[PDB]
Amino acid sequence: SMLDDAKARLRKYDIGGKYSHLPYNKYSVLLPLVAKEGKLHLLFTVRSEKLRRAPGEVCFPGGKRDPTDMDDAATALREAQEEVGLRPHQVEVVCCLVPCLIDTDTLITPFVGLIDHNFQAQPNPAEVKDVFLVPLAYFLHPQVHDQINHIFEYTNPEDGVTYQIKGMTANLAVLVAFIILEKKPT
């Protein structure tokens, strides 16, 4: 099946806990996969304009590890719950992708999660201005604008709203699309 095939692909890129004990400032992100209308989508947040770090930018749910977290995957799930109301029973964490090094002292670990079909986002307005889906296949043929670094523009055909996706967020979206969608019969 589509979901079994995605999980099987994702598992081949799982690095697991290999890098998780290293003494960094630690953040986790959830790359949330949603199946709608026969296709896979990624769920993105738009950060509240109130936030000091990157107000109004598109990112994945996630945040800083805290002492309660049993592991890095727990960080991502805790933060996703706080930000968009995703409950742990509504997500299956399939794997841990390549961590992202930033600022010399920070390590961001991404987890891919399969999201339950009955989940409906409840944006927490103190943290999240908007939540939206992008079809995973979009990231294979994105609409690119050079700002000189590359920015994706995605227009939701439901309402005509355009979102800008860039940086680590855009890079991780492409990675997940390659992993899941490369080399498939039609």
Ligand SMILES: O=C(Cc1cccc(O)c1)Nc1ccccn1
């Ligand atoms: O803070 C995060 C996770 C993260 C961590 C490092 C980089 C990044 O782009 C994203 N995501 C968030 C925070 C508030 C509202 C929505 N989403």
